[PDB]
Design an enzyme around this catalytic site. Structure first.
Site, mmCIF file in Angstrom:
data_model
loop_
_atom_site.group_PDB
_atom_site.id
_atom_site.type_symbol
_atom_site.label_atom_id
_atom_site.label_comp_id
_atom_site.label_asym_id
_atom_site.label_seq_id
_atom_site.Cartn_x
_atom_site.Cartn_y
_atom_site.Cartn_z
ATOM 1 N N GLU A 1 1.852 3.996 64.318
ATOM 2 C CA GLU A 1 2.261 3.293 63.095
ATOM 3 C C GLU A 1 2.520 1.815 63.361
ATOM 4 O OE1 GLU A 1 5.966 3.430 59.762
ATOM 5 O OE2 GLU A 1 5.850 4.919 61.347
ATOM 6 N N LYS B 1 0.751 4.967 54.153
ATOM 7 C CA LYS B 1 1.867 5.909 54.109
ATOM 8 C C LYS B 1 2.170 6.332 52.669
ATOM 9 C CE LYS B 1 5.525 5.193 56.837
ATOM 10 N NZ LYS B 1 6.762 4.446 57.198
ATOM 11 N N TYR C 1 16.487 7.858 52.018
ATOM 12 C CA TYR C 1 17.306 7.812 53.233
ATOM 13 C C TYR C 1 16.539 7.194 54.419
ATOM 14 C CZ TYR C 1 14.708 12.229 53.463
ATOM 15 O OH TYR C 1 13.720 13.185 53.412
ATOM 16 N N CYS D 1 4.042 8.885 59.939
ATOM 17 C CA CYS D 1 5.465 9.230 60.041
ATOM 18 C C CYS D 1 6.017 10.112 58.928
ATOM 19 C CB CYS D 1 6.328 7.964 60.211
ATOM 20 S SG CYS D 1 7.883 8.220 61.157
ATOM 21 N N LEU E 1 32.568 -10.427 84.076
ATOM 22 C CA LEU E 1 33.018 -9.273 84.846
ATOM 23 C C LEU E 1 34.534 -9.238 84.961
ATOM 24 C CD1 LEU E 1 30.297 -9.224 87.644
ATOM 25 C CD2 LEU E 1 30.283 -8.021 85.450
#
Lengths: 568, 563
Positions: A44, A126, A132, A162, A332
């Protein structure tokens, strides 16, 4: 029955790098043709990259996408692959206005094309664009209302993209009524940590549903916050695994299949969802029989810790590499977060390209200083120390800060120090904040609010320990030096906290349901309240690798200005 | 033609403050009933605030909304207003699964209800939830499929919520085919700077299409980056303004109308979009006709500069107040942006609650300090000056940064200062960046950016207007004249407006008359400024199509616009 050799190329595209993506497609096609492949597939939107966001709303990028597909088809034939059909994902647009959907002129389509004879032979787009998910293709995209079928060597091959396979009633049963023998689906599927094998159960179901072998080819790599896991699969008519590609690596799957012959008087016109059958006949005639030596193979699975850690590496590596950068800079503290980030950075870029800075205060401890230096020693890290003590005094003199204000000063100094060093030396600052701290808006203290990428921002503290411990163990398994100091590992409480956050932030359960699961009301309400009020802090947090489906994704959000209090 | 008195309440709700919203709706109902009203309306989602975003998805929040509505209705009658129908906007969820939209029971709905006799007498929810527009109720919300009508004193009053009126064949023609006297529309419409009066255009076209008198009641106030501009209208059957509320002010419209009564046997059943007529009858029999006195009154229209300035003020004021803050901290250079922000803050909070800080470096000019100091005196803000040079020297002692980093260091030093003082003293730091700077990626930190959706060209125009405003009432011009008079900006902003605001491509901007090399360079700069404007604080929006979270580009992006 009839035989065919299919090459599926699980590759990594770069958003917007159209020419560079075209080059890779060519490079992988040559590599596929050498292995005797009859069909070559790419994921895709492989020509443009994915997700391409508002670049889909621009005519110039759509036209660049369109032109390059035409040029790639022509470059294929010029290289002597004009008889070889190649399926390529790309971006297109609808010429017409759209009455059937309510889309104007030049609305984009997520498309895929079959390249043959130096031309674009077939173009579909597609069909199912869900409400969603993460990608808002629903708002802007014109769907394809087409059931694409390719007669190749006597075999009807059905094509999908997909989310087509997410729809109950879409191109999968439409393939059946069109009489497909092979279902070829091209994908860009963002990684999502889950103990279930969601990939296998999706393709299993849909293969039996289509009544044919189903090939699922997926993108690999990271784009901004997302990561594509790869994990391409082929699954047969009865749901059994033919071949399966690795998670989180570029790779090809070239395999031989046994496929039913297509009906010599095949169906035409509207099918299941209203999709017209778009036939394209490369070969009506069956192929001469040959030795089916290749089965594709089942690549070795990764364990839960390895799988997450890999996604983090690929995420960070891609942000650095695809933005032009070579190097990172990490503050760090000697703490577990920074140590895990440094370890991820060394695996992503090499130890030479990761630069650590210890930024001590007057009252900062000596195991803080020590463990940073320790971590440097076992990684091959470019370590340095600059004390923030001189700038602290300079500020305190002309301001006079007390309490909460004076503690916050410390972190902003370290942020400024990391930013200034990276401005000089050309590094990308990495933000060390984990998902637990981000959820409740916890005070960073080493300038986490400052930084360009946050590699562990979607990882809970409970999982940070689990990943560090695995990493150290992974080194020892192969005689290599465990990278993270043990003193960094072993120095409401985190396991209960993360559990409540998971229920609230990832599974969206409310206070009542969290208490009913067995947690204490006071600490539940306190935690939820803290999550809600942390909105503005995480709106301004750097991007980082998402490994969960729902979370703090920019997709869902609370107001900043909000006087609602949970658990009243 | 019958009469009734209608009280429209253009109020300001606070998001999540359900008890406080109910407290304010009660107080406004008291003031409506004391002015002898027969119907009291409130805006869309008034009980709850707007927009609530992901709070809409929580059972706890949705149940708190519904319970408060029932508690409000029952409190109305206990305060002795049970005879008076009160219309309130609130958040609801669907009781049953609705297979038409394929939604499960409990899906959120943008609803409104009529409160009467200590009860919730009628409910309905928004029908049209558009694909376009700033809000996305389209995703999560389930449309209400009724066409609600109220029989109050012999008159049929039809009800709608905001985007219902945007729909061709919506609840508008459905009210015509239902035979309605009055079309009461409750709204929460965000502010967009437009020279056209789109509000009047909408309500005129719709009152004609309905063929009746139409009242558009709107929310006023600020919420995050959005500002609601009030400006409620009443428009007759033919399309003429009966009354018009002020912009950017809380207020009420109380007036009397002439309305057609409906039949003893009115229509029932499916109407236009398949909407089922839900009637609620308070009174079938007409009111005792009496002395018609209240006209409504057309409030004064603000001019273009004043309109924009009010929006900026209301936005800032809301973000401070509703968040429990009292005061703000603004860093002051000599520049025009810092001065206009100071000016807006003083209008929003009072000058006492505005705290300015000049932060000079090793080579910081005299006009920087001078104009910063000027501003403080002709305003009344709390001034102070801290040098950043004591802390600039401490950094360069142990870092030794050359041109690239050492220029940026100065900006970060000022940010640290601002945040420290605000951490100490309890102010909200204000970000001074404008739309032109933000688009290009120049520069810083803070909680709110009052002028972030305002171009630099518009920054001067607004600045000069504010001095002109002061002098028009004998007040001291707040923005220093030297501050005002310190790609060139007007061509730059013209290109940005074409690209960002009107979605026009490079080739077409060149076609419009602009230089190809400059256009390309600008558009390249905009594309790569993405990561900067993502980590930028919130701020007032004045255009619906501009920057925001709705439209965005990838950060990792090797696409370059131009050949």
């Amino acid at each position: 029955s009839l035989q065919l050799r299919l090459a599926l190329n699980q590759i990594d595209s770069t958003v917007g790098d159209i020419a560079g993506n075209a080059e890779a497609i060519l490079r992988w096609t040559r590599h596929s043709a050498e292995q005797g492949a009859h069909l070559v597939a790419f994921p895709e939107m492989a020509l443009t990259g994915y997700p391409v966001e508002d670049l889909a709303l621009r005519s110039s990028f759509v036209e660049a996408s369109r032109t390059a597909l035409r040029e790639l088809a022509a470059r294929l034939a010029e290289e002597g692959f004009g008889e070889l059909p190649v399926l390529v994902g790309y971006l297109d647009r609808s010429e017409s206005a759209q009455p059937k959907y309510g889309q104007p002129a030049g609305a984009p389509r997520n498309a895929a094309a079959v390249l043959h004879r130096g031309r674009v032979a077939l173009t579909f787009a597609k069909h199912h664009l869900p409400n969603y998910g993460v990608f808002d293709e629903f708002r802007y995209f014109v769907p394809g209302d087409t059931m694409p079928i390719v007669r190749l060597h006597g075999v009807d091959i059905a094509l999908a993209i997909c989310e087509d396979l997410w729809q109950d009633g879409g191109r999968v049963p439409a393939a059946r009524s069109a009489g497909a023998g092979l279902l070829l689906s091209v994908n860009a599927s963002p990684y999502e940590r889950d103990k279930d094998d969601t990939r296998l159960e999706l393709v299993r179901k849909r293969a039996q549903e289509a009544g044919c072998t189903t090939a699922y080819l997926a993108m690999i790599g990271g784009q901004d916050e997302l990561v594509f896991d790869g994990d391409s699969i082929v699954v047969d008519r009865d749901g059994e695994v033919v071949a399966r590609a690795p998670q989180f690596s570029e790779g090809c799957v070239v395999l031989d299949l046994d496929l039913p012959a297509a009906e010599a008087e095949p169906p035409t016109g509207v099918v299941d969802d209203g999709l017209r059958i778009d036939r394209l006949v490369i070969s009506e005639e069956p192929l001469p029989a040959y030795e089916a030596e290749l089965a594709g193979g089942y690549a070795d699975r990764l364990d839960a810790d390895e799988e997450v850690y890999s996604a983090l590496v690929v995420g960070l590596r891609a942000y650095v590499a695809k933005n032009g950068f070579r190097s990172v800079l990490i503050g760090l503290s000697g703490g577990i977060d920074s140590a895990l980030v440094a370890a991820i950075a060394c695996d992503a870029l090499g130890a030479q390209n990761v630069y650590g800075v210890s930024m001590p205060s007057k009252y900062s401890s000596d195991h803080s200083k020590g463990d940073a230096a320790e971590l440097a020693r076992r990684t091959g890290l470019n370590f340095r120390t600059v004390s923030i003590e001189p700038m602290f005094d300079a500020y305190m003199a002309s301001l006079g800060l007390t309490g909460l204000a004076e503690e916050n000063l410390q972190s902003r100094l370290r942020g400024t120090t990391l930013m200034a060093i990276s401005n000089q030396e050309g590094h990308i600052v990495l933000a060390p904040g984990n998902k637990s701290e981000l959820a409740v808006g916890y005070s960073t203290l080493y300038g986490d609010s400052v930084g360009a990428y946050g590699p562990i921002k979607d990882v809970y503290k409970t999982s940070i320990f689990r990943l560090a411990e695995w990493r150290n163990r992974a080194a020892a398994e192969r005689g290599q030096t465990p990278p993270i100091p043990e003193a960094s590992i072993t120095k409401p409480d985190y396991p209960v906290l993360d559990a409540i956050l998971e229920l609230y932030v990832d599974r969206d359960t409310g206070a009542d349901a969290i208490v009913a699961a067995g947690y204490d009301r006071e600490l539940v309400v306190k935690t939820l309240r803290m999550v809600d009020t942390a909105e503005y802090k995480r709106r301004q947090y750097p991007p980082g690798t998402k490994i969960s489906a729902k979370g703090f994704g920019k997709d869902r959000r609370l107001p900043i200005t909000n006087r609602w209090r949970e658990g009243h």
